[PDB]
Design a protein around this ligand. Sequence first.
Ligand SMILES: Nc1ncnc2c1ncn2[C@@H]1O[C@H](COP(=O)(O)OP(=O)(O)OP(=O)(O)O)[C@@H](O)[C@H]1O
Ligand SMILES: Nc1ncnc2c1ncn2[C@@H]1O[C@H](COP(=O)(O)OP(=O)(O)OP(=O)(O)O)[C@@H](O)[C@H]1O
Ligand SMILES: Nc1ncnc2c1ncn2[C@@H]1O[C@H](COP(=O)(O)OP(=O)(O)O)[C@@H](O)[C@H]1O
Ligand SMILES: [Mg+2]
Ligand SMILES: [Mg+2]
Ligand SMILES: [Mg+2]
Lengths: 191, 234, 405, 395
Amino acid sequence: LDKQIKEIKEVIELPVKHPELFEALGIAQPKGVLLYGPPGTGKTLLARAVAHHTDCTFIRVSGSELVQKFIGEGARMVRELFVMAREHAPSIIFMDEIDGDSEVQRTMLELLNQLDGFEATKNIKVIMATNRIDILDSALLRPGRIDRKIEFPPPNEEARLDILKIHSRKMNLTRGINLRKIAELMPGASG
Amino acid sequence: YDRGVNTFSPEGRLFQVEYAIEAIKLGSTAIGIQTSEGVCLAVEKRITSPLMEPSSIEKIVEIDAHIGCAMSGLIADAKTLIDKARVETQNHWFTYNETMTVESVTQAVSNLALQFGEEDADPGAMSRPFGVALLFGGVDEKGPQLFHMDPSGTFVQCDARAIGSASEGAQSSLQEVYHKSMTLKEAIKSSLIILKQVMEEKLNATNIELATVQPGQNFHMFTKEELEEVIKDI
Amino acid sequence: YEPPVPTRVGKKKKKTKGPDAASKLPLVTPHTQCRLKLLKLERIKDYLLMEEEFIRNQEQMKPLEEKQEEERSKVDDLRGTPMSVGTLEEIIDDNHAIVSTSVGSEHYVSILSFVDKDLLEPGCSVLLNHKVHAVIGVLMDDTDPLVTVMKVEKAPQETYADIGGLDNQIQEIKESVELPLTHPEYYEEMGIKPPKGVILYGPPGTGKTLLAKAVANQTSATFLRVVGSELIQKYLGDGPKLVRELFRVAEEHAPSIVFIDEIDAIGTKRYDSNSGGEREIQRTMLELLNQLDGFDSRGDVKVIMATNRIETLDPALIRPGRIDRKIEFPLPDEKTKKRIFQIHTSRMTLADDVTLDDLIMAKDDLSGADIKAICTEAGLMALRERRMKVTNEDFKKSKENVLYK
Amino acid sequence: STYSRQIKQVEDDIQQLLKKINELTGIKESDTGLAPPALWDLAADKQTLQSEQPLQVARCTKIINADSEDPKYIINVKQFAKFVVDLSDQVAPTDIEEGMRVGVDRNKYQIHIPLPPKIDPTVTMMQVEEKPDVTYSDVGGCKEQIEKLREVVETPLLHPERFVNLGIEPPKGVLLFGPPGTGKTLCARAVANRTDACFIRVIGSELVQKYVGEGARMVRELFEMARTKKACLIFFDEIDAIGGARFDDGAGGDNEVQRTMLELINQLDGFDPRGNIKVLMATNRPDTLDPALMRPGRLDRKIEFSLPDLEGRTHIFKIHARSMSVERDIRFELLARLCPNSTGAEIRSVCTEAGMFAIRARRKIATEKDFLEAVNKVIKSYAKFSATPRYMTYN
Ligand SMILES: Nc1ncnc2c1ncn2[C@@H]1O[C@H](COP(=O)(O)OP(=O)(O)OP(=O)(O)O)[C@@H](O)[C@H]1O
Ligand SMILES: Nc1ncnc2c1ncn2[C@@H]1O[C@H](COP(=O)(O)OP(=O)(O)OP(=O)(O)O)[C@@H](O)[C@H]1O
Ligand SMILES: Nc1ncnc2c1ncn2[C@@H]1O[C@H](COP(=O)(O)OP(=O)(O)O)[C@@H](O)[C@H]1O
Ligand SMILES: [Mg+2]
Ligand SMILES: [Mg+2]
Ligand SMILES: [Mg+2]
């Protein structure tokens, strides 16, 4: 996912670390990112990694009621979470659509509406993860809402080999494992 | 919607008939007066732009040499009724060698109203009532005669009837100024006076139509000079 | 036995909130530095001198027990410590009330004299003595987190100059949310109250929310922003409750502007978390109807609504009296498209080979959002190649990026 | 400018003087709910703190041996406990009844004072304390409707002697119905302004509650507190929120709201007499109301707020353009003729938009042309969004 790493870097790392680049370019800093791909392709993994490397607080918004007491005793609007996010800026608000209408995409719409021009504090980025991009609402697919859409296709033979090398490194492996052959033995596999 | 065209309200009203009756109140004001000297029909053209040609706004129609009609509301809907009146007339003349009674013409036009439906209807049958109100005025054996017809098919003879947007105030003024024994010139002047006080625009010989059906004489649409002759007073 | 009879009319607190209190000095006119203003100021000064001398004398021959600091210390002793926080359940009498502590146990206690009796209403948080539970004060309720959520603390940086082509729309919205506040004399002299409500409708990306941001930039009133989908709650009656509390907060911070953005999303979207189905949404809509134009008197609250699907709204919601003006935002024409491109590339460093005339017809149904996205993505492509000057190839890739795929 | 230095000198002196005064007198705190010190009766406060003991609120449950001279009272002290106590010497035995709230001491829990019944604070706030600023003179074209409403909701309260003498029982319920903007809530506000009895405004959406049976509880408490007054009026705005007709859709479709509506119906006309309460409901969807709610004895009068006729529209135009700086020859009759089926709200918007057109042209007087453009903009241009054509099928 080197291409995905670079794409998410240029949108989440640069505005936090170097807002002057976007100011000199005369363009608005990105505030919303979409990561779309089959489940298990590393969308949550890349979001957590980009939050970890930029020292941006990673907040996962699953909409679960169990955590509502931590968000706020009100719980009438999801934007009540922003008070926490502003307290930990730079922040990355992450929501993964497991897949009526989708509550994750509704939360996306509300957070993006707040972040458009009505949010004072900067460096508060927002990420979605979704399985498919053709199911997204027309409001979310409108230009200007999601500043960058990044695809996470299932790994090919070389990417599968890289994932295999990463994950087999945690194991007592006999020398001479032909991980390339095993990668060839898993067509159409996810991470 | 869920309702059909032939649906009765809990109060006994035909829904589409009442809704078509409500369409007349958006139409231009027409005033018909019947007197022993003849029938005078007047209507306001309601010109919406200086570029529009007033002569093309035909709201008083020659039904036959002895009968005219003034329409108010949806003028396009009135074309079918006018054509049926002008075809039904000259069919009485074809078979009986005589002009129709104004009452007979109005009754024949009335029979068209309510001839609408959704199911169990002919392919040429209408789908909605005629959102127009007609004022027939003519001369027959009973002398001059003025009849009013409304989208419910209810036609009734009237001494002086005002239809259209200003039907209420114009009818009140007609009741105030009408007496049975008055001349046709007085009727024309009174109708023009009532029209002038209800027009949105200013009354002139271009934005109104005046016609007369007198005994002996034929149906006559007033020209610009004749209109200016009577307008110059009031 | 006879029940006590209160002397205060009603059971609600005084409507006036946050006044000058005892500092309400008379308004001296004219403001010009003339001798008449000078004389009025001197008269106020002489009355203050007389008051000062009288109060000093009275406190001078008052007993040592009866002194301002001594009476404050006695008030503190009467209250004691700690001071429990209970709920004013009922005002039985002027100096007697039923209050419930945090443990759910109610007590018929006495309201002491130093309590601000005009701050007492049922449900208000009161401070009670720890031992005898007598009402010793009223707790100024802290701002609700939801109050913070609606209120726009910092004005958006988008101004009217950043909007291109919406001249008539800007004029119509200014006549309803800006001119009535800056120049009320026009409306007063004309004998009409300003247009009550405004709804901005049009295709997506046309600038409705941008115009709302511009209004929020140049407004002296409190700005509350609520998305329509935020009015859909997870529990029965919570939607109407949220609408009621939103307009209560709007009334508290008068003058205020309530921006119900994406109102149609309350009805066009169905979520399974909504316990009640379309019927609870209808009840929320009825509550919104009451808030927009209902029985309760409305203060200086202006309502702005935005939607890209106005055909799906209940017509009784946007009826005149509730929403007087329906401002349409059409897709930009060529002049407006050029203005938008110049607005969003004003801070850009364009190349000599880039022309906005070619980009003006990138798509027939081009909107302001599409143009801004084109510019932002072209700048992103320039950033990818470590460049500060955006080339025509960057814009070409931008068009195939945002508009297509 | 010659007085500016002395102006600032005396202004600073005044500010310092005000601060000095506030130093001796008071005006501070205001976050702990402290009244100004001029109202501090500290000696009386101490005497109250000592003499006036606190009283815990309990509920009497059963009176044992009420006939004899030693009646024992079982009280339920809220979340605290349950006790068997006796009345204090200062309370008559007939002043305490089973099921009523009492206030007892903390030592022996002897009943010390009978207490008013518990009422939800949300129900308490529903009663109107500031009357609206609308009179019957602000409603045009509704002469018959206003007369019928007044002779039910105002005349029996004002002059009851005209009804008792002839053995006449006036109607105790009015339903105002009509298309949106026709003046239902305007007439209700006029009633609340003119009324002298207790007026309670209830919005149907306020009767929708999260939990099961809570809406019926609010209705019960509303009619309980309405019965604690000699004469009372309850206004049910948008009664179609909870007044919908009962239905069985397999699932539990609107069961709780139907129970709330059933409780309201039982309060209106049930086994127990309603009392001197005269209810008033307004809705733009009267076709959805339950037949039992639309029945005489619950909604005796059904006043229709149909769209104004020509005379009514002219009257509304005169009402809303009364304070307008209009020209001398405004043909308000013509304007009323130009909007055949229009609500009073549309007429008010026409007046406001004519004023806005005049203001936009920097003119202090609105001409007839301005009113014509206002009619075009409101009646014609906005006719796409009109709620009228859809809602007269419902009425
Ligand atoms: N006419 C315009 N002039 C200048 N910029 C514009 C214009 N229209 C849109 N924009 C730009 O597009 C961005 C996004 O548009 P905006 O969110 O205001 O559209 P909207 O019509 O409210 O859309 P939605 O229906 O999706 O809520 C704005 O922040 C603004 O920068
Ligand atoms: N008959 C009337 N005379 C004068 N003004 C009227 C009349 N009817 C309506 N209005 C005006 O129009 C406004 C419409 O608001 P109102 O509360 O009367 O509507 P409503 O009938 O209760 O509507 P809804 O059914 O949507 O609740 C009123 O505030 C008033 O200014
Ligand atoms: N490209 C990848 N490289 C390495 N590990 C991966 C990759 N994709 C998925 N994984 C592993 O799969 C696990 C779950 O994947 P996750 O990121 O939750 O999938 P999704 O992208 O659908 O959220 C992670 O713990 C991660 O270690
Ligand atoms: Mg996943
Ligand atoms: Mg928007
Ligand atoms: Mg109403």
